[PDB]
Design an enzyme around this catalytic site. Structure first.
Site, PDB file in Angstrom:
ATOM      1  N   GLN A  10     -65.700 -37.604 -74.847  1.00 34.30           N
ATOM      2  CA  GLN A  10     -65.109 -36.587 -75.702  1.00 34.30           C
ATOM      3  C   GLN A  10     -63.606 -36.525 -75.509  1.00 34.30           C
ATOM      4  O   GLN A  10     -63.132 -36.589 -74.377  1.00 34.30           O
ATOM      5  CB  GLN A  10     -65.726 -35.226 -75.393  1.00 34.30           C
ATOM      6  CG  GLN A  10     -65.209 -34.082 -76.245  1.00 34.30           C
ATOM      7  CD  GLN A  10     -65.953 -33.975 -77.553  1.00 34.30           C
ATOM      8  OE1 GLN A  10     -67.183 -34.033 -77.577  1.00 34.30           O
ATOM      9  NE2 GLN A  10     -65.215 -33.821 -78.652  1.00 34.30           N
ATOM     10  N   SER A  88     -68.717 -39.004 -68.977  1.00 33.14           N
ATOM     11  CA  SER A  88     -69.614 -37.998 -69.546  1.00 33.14           C
ATOM     12  C   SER A  88     -70.528 -38.638 -70.592  1.00 33.14           C
ATOM     13  O   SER A  88     -71.480 -39.339 -70.233  1.00 33.14           O
ATOM     14  CB  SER A  88     -68.827 -36.831 -70.143  1.00 33.14           C
ATOM     15  OG  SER A  88     -69.613 -35.649 -70.161  1.00 33.14           O
ATOM     16  N   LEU A  89     -70.244 -38.390 -71.874  1.00 31.13           N
ATOM     17  CA  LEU A  89     -70.948 -39.050 -72.977  1.00 31.13           C
ATOM     18  C   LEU A  89     -70.952 -40.579 -72.775  1.00 31.13           C
ATOM     19  O   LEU A  89     -71.972 -41.248 -73.009  1.00 31.13           O
ATOM     20  CB  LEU A  89     -70.307 -38.666 -74.321  1.00 31.13           C
ATOM     21  CG  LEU A  89     -70.738 -39.313 -75.656  1.00 31.13           C
ATOM     22  CD1 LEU A  89     -70.147 -40.731 -75.839  1.00 31.13           C
ATOM     23  CD2 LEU A  89     -72.269 -39.306 -75.860  1.00 31.13           C
ATOM     24  N   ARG A 113     -78.421 -33.971 -76.707  1.00 31.83           N
ATOM     25  CA  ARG A 113     -77.457 -33.553 -75.700  1.00 31.83           C
ATOM     26  C   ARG A 113     -76.304 -32.793 -76.333  1.00 31.83           C
ATOM     27  O   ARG A 113     -75.908 -31.722 -75.846  1.00 31.83           O
ATOM     28  CB  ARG A 113     -76.917 -34.759 -74.941  1.00 31.83           C
ATOM     29  CG  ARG A 113     -75.950 -34.407 -73.840  1.00 31.83           C
ATOM     30  CD  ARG A 113     -75.042 -35.584 -73.565  1.00 31.83           C
ATOM     31  NE  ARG A 113     -74.448 -35.542 -72.234  1.00 31.83           N
ATOM     32  CZ  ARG A 113     -73.140 -35.522 -72.002  1.00 31.83           C
ATOM     33  NH1 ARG A 113     -72.283 -35.548 -73.010  1.00 31.83           N
ATOM     34  NH2 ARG A 113     -72.683 -35.498 -70.758  1.00 31.83           N
ATOM     35  N   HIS A 188     -70.022 -29.227 -67.814  1.00 29.26           N
ATOM     36  CA  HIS A 188     -69.966 -29.742 -66.447  1.00 29.26           C
ATOM     37  C   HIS A 188     -69.771 -28.619 -65.439  1.00 29.26           C
ATOM     38  O   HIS A 188     -68.855 -28.642 -64.618  1.00 29.26           O
ATOM     39  CB  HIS A 188     -68.866 -30.793 -66.324  1.00 29.26           C
ATOM     40  CG  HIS A 188     -69.180 -32.040 -67.080  1.00 29.26           C
ATOM     41  ND1 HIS A 188     -70.207 -32.882 -66.721  1.00 29.26           N
ATOM     42  CD2 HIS A 188     -68.647 -32.557 -68.213  1.00 29.26           C
ATOM     43  CE1 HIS A 188     -70.284 -33.875 -67.588  1.00 29.26           C
ATOM     44  NE2 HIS A 188     -69.350 -33.699 -68.506  1.00 29.26           N
ATOM     45  N   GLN A 237     -76.027 -34.624 -64.569  1.00 32.96           N
ATOM     46  CA  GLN A 237     -74.665 -34.797 -65.051  1.00 32.96           C
ATOM     47  C   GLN A 237     -74.125 -33.590 -65.802  1.00 32.96           C
ATOM     48  O   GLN A 237     -72.936 -33.291 -65.728  1.00 32.96           O
ATOM     49  CB  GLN A 237     -74.583 -36.023 -65.951  1.00 32.96           C
ATOM     50  CG  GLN A 237     -73.188 -36.319 -66.469  1.00 32.96           C
ATOM     51  CD  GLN A 237     -73.233 -37.086 -67.754  1.00 32.96           C
ATOM     52  OE1 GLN A 237     -73.967 -36.712 -68.678  1.00 32.96           O
ATOM     53  NE2 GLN A 237     -72.471 -38.173 -67.826  1.00 32.96           N
TER      54      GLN A 237
END
Length: 293
Positions: A10, A88-89, A113, A188, A237
């Protein structure tokens, strides 16, 4: 020589990304697959309004589909990764690149997600560039409303939490700039708990193959290839911190000589500059990049 492929998340999206890829058969096909799975065209959405593209429910499956396309385009040219990681992604793209799940399974995960996180709003995240590491700890020690969400480079972190709390540390930690991210959730962090726990139910029911190369995961960037440990790390995560700094150091030290950002933007090579500057960087996010080998 050993090469890492790292996948941006992102914030790396830009308008027009992936669109030049469309003349390849591989891209055409996967775009059509993504369109049946998602119910909307990734190509069309990447050419839309900027703000609209930045909405995480668009951005995440868009970045994943494009990154998976880039990975396969690289493969078709003969190049192969020694190590994979993703921010992340990005981790999902890395996992697909490593054979842990197929293209479609991955897109469905990303879709869910990104819906979860889009609906899990309320709080806020900010990035800090060039900060007093000492003053950061005092402002974070005993802080129930603000946590460290990304550890990206010695010069840069991202904190996450309540709007009030993140604005606070902003004003009383030496550093600037200190910039609110264009996301509206406490990503997160433990705020993602209830959102992260329904999606986890979905994730555990999904069979994970072992990886064909080492994956360095966000919550624990020690290289591994075990399918079940990787799922475990992935399940962790969403509420946990992105240890990207440590990801790069681990890379440079387990052997990797080259570092390829497979996706749009220059964020992850930018980070790598000021962390492991003896590593060779390429940015592969356009057909023009691919063609230069």
């Amino acid at each position: 020589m050993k090469t890492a492929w790292v996948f941006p998340g992102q914030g790396s999206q830009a308008v027009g990304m992936g669109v030049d890829l469309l003349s390849t058969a591989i891209a055409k096909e996967k775009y059509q697959q993504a369109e049946e799975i998602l119910g909307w065209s990734v190509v069309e959405k990447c050419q839309g309004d900027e703000a609209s593209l930045a909405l995480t429910q668009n951005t995440q499956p868009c970045l994943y589909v494009i990154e998976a396309i880039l990975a396969d385009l690289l493969r078709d040219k003969g190049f192969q990764p020694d190590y994979v990681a993703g921010h992340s992604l990005g981790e999902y793209s890395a996992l697909y690149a490593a054979g842990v799940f197929d293209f479609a399974t991955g897109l469905q995960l990303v879709k869910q997600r990104s819906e979860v996180m889009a609906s899990a709003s309320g709080g806020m995240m900010a990035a800090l560039m060039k900060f007093d590491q000492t003053q950061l700890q005092q402002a974070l020690t005993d802080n129930t409303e603000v946590v460290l969400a990304n550890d990206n480079s010695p010069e840069q972190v991202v904190i996450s939490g309540t709007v009030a709390g993140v604005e606070a540390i902003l004003a009383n930690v030496k550093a600037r700039r200190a910039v609110p991210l264009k996301v509206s959730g406490a990503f997160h962090s433990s705020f993602m708990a209830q959102p992260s726990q329904s999606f986890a139910q979905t994730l555990t029911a999904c069979h994970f193959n072992d990886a064909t190369v080492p994956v360095l995961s966000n919550v624990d960037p020690s290289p591994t290839q075990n399918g079940d440990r990787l799922k475990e790390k992935l399940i962790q995560q969403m509420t946990g911190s992105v240890r990207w700094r440590e990801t790069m150091v681990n890379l440079g030290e387990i052997g990797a000589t080259d570092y390829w950002e497979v996706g749009p933007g220059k964020v992850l090579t930018g980070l790598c500059k000021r962390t492991c500057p003896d590593l060779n960087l390429k940015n592969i996010g356009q057909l023009d990049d691919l063609n230069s080998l």
